[PDB]
Amino acid sequence: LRVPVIDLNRVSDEEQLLPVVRAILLQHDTFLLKNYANKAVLDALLAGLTTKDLPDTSQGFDANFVWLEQYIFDTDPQLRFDRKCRNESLCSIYSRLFKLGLFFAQLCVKSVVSSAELQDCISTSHYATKLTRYFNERDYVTFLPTGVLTIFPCAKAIRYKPSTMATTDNSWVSIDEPDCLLFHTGTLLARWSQGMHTTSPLQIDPRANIVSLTIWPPLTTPISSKGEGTIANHLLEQQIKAFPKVAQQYYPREL
Amino acid sequence: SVLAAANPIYGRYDDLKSPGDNIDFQTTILSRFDMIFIVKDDHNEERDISIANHVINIHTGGSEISIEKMKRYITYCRLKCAPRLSPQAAEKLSSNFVTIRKQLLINELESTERSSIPITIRQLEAIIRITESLAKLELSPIAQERHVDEAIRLFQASTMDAAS
Amino acid sequence: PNVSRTIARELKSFLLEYTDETGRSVYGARIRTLGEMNSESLEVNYRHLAESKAILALFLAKCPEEMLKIFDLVAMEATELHYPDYARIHSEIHVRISDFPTIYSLRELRESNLSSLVRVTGVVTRRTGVFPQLKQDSNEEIRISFCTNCKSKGPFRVNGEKTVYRNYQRVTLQEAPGTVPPGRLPRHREVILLADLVDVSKPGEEVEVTGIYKNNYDGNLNAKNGFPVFATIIEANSIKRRSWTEEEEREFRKISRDRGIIDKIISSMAPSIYGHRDIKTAVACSLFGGVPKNVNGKHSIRGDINVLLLGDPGTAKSQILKYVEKTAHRAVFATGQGASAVGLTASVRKDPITKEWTLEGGALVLADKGVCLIDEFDKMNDQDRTSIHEAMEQQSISISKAGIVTTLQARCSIIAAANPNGGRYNSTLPLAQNVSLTEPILSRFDILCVVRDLVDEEADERLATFVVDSHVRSHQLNARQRRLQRQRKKEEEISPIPQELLMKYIHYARTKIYPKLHQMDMDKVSRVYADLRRESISTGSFPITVRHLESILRIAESFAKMRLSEFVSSYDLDRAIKVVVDSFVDAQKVSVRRQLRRSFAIY
């Protein structure tokens, strides 16, 4: 039940919780935020409901069942990336939680080898975010935060697989968070922070509509010598086309 | 005093038969017993419609002279006290019982469906002693009329309801 | 294994410095969880250790208890070098292991297995309280050579105190009922509970123990001097209170997604019965069970049906419940002849031989999370009747008795085969008057299977043809192929689903699906309930209470499980209302014919 939580009106200055968030992710690595300014427009996430008319082709909402409308939001200004969904309150929450996520990165990613390249997602604004909506047996595979950092609202949003991570007991770790925003670091920042991170399986929840503001580093992002030739973008794009059914267009079928 | 309560049998069978009948009915056990009651909490009509929402309730969901201070006033009345009842309200209770018996001796010509007009003679002294306690609430060595008359009205409502 | 100092070193290479999948030491987490929780008990994830060093895992066969005793002391010094405070906090720490592939059932244990590690299933039949066990007679009390002043014949008396006491709870574990083949008494094995595991288990509940299998003696000699009572005792080391193939559930869904399942199941619910679809329907309904729902607000209401079968001689009711005993998962068949109320519910006794308090799970307790099948009600004493009424209302068995206090939970449903007073159904006379069972226990049940035998020139001819064909069909590797497949051809002569499919089906259902409702019809079904209430006040006396309503949804959810919907459907709720209303109809007097129209507004 114990998850580190902080007051943000005391740290709205961005000068109070710079190194302790790193010192606490060193062991816990799954953070919980509370009471930001977005406590009302956050509630209004029932705008983008019934589009269901645009084919996927690796952009926009995958209509995969009436059950799932997964807005794989291909970032807006990138080369061969241009997508905008209605997402009215969803995009307002995007801007808010995006400023908050830059806040969180610039207070945590600052602790590591280089604190410019990942947040280099402010140069080109390379956020291909994850607007999943399970709107009206087994469901999506245990979901690691595909990117490297993501803050996102949540109701249950947590499980745990048989594996060696935080809470290594390998039993499903499911908790309830009434009015709490879950932050989770993703895959490659562990490698960037030299192995201090974890993962958390996801499933369908009372908040079956996961808005996920993946910081989603830029396209040509040169990963360390192990990933100088394997950038994070194409790796996690193959990942994006791995877990769901990939049949709309040919290249993901081939992948 | 005593406290006797449990989940009544047949659900709300207490509504059909006497206010008693939480346990066996035999009139012999009831003999030494003095007063029977029913409690009203804020769920009565949940038996017609709200029961639906009720199971949905399962699915989708001091400001007073302190406790020790009441115990303190009580120990200080166990110490010394003489707040006895008042003769005028006493005769008022005697009236609002005997004149009831006289109106009903007159209405015997109507042949009331009340089974057998009982001697309300231990319940009457019960009311007398409760007005005595409501006077103890006010220290008056001859009972003030406020508490005594309130208790009189409420216990005649109770006794009348029982008779009904 | 004397030089095992180096071996303890090599196994303590895995002690802290093992991690996997981005660090996060398996025990680096455990050590701090102990430093913060103080539970004096280490977990050992056997999956990962099995990957670590095969020799260490295999060392659980030759001297497994010696192995573990060497291991846990160094685990203690490990968490102490990590937390120099921890050694003083507790007195001593013993480890626990995660899981084994060895699933030796209680019916299978051999001398080769003893003193080794074993993981067994079963049910806690009954348990005891804490023992201050004894454990120059250190713990002999049968071996006294010349330590007596009058040692020739004048007896010297030793005390039974000042001696070391181990937390010691002897729990009887028996084979799971139903799985026990008919005739054989289920085995008993005394498992031992200790410091951390004491009182962690109750009776009536499934358990899985992982302890070693010692051949240890008990000082309760009771037979001869130099001869303690030797019991093959399981020493517990981890307790778990708690699969099938993918395409199995896939084709399973492929079937269950049809439209005929809700009636194919019925027509396959009973292997050799003619007619009685209505009673087979109620059987299936109370077999599948419904989603229970605890209510801290007013009172926990169980979602478990309770069918009373008011039978009549000739009608195959006992055969139905015998089928149920076979098919269901937790059947406890018990007849009203050997009732002995102490037996049905749980009870607590003192054993005369050992002078020890035990409390033994009753039939209701032994059946928890299942079906308790009783018959010949009217042939049992009224006190059994009272105890069972109590149990049904609270769906559990509290107990506060001499030296003990707890509350066993007895969710398990009840099927009951009855027999009307004297002979058969007299007439259309009311069901209550027709049976010597009390109105409270009658209302405790929800469904009342009213069966009746009636002479007919034709229906009995067809039924007879059926029964005769039944007695006809009753009676190497390729012979076994030709035999299994011919048994399956007979399984298809009763055309719907074969049996094994259906028992896997009921297991799947009672495991995974937990359907619910929508707001839409619940107030219109309360409307239909009010209409029933007016048709019942037109009937004079009637038990139409909240139970009679809640039964409807409790049946509809079972129907949803049948359909695997996770949410009620229209047709299923109509089936439920039909079953309940006409089950009521049968109970009533001549009015029944009028009733056929009176409360007909539903249909």
Ligand SMILES: Nc1ncnc2c1ncn2[C@@H]1O[C@H](COP(=O)(O)OP(=O)(O)OP(O)(O)=S)[C@@H](O)[C@H]1O
């Ligand atoms: N449809 C049927 N098909 C085949 N046999 C049937 C059928 N209906 C009844 N039977 C017969 O019923 C027998 C079992 O009936 P039971 O349920 O045991 O009656 P019963 O309840 O034992 O009678 P009691 O309890 O003494 S009043 C079977 O052995 C069959 O011979």
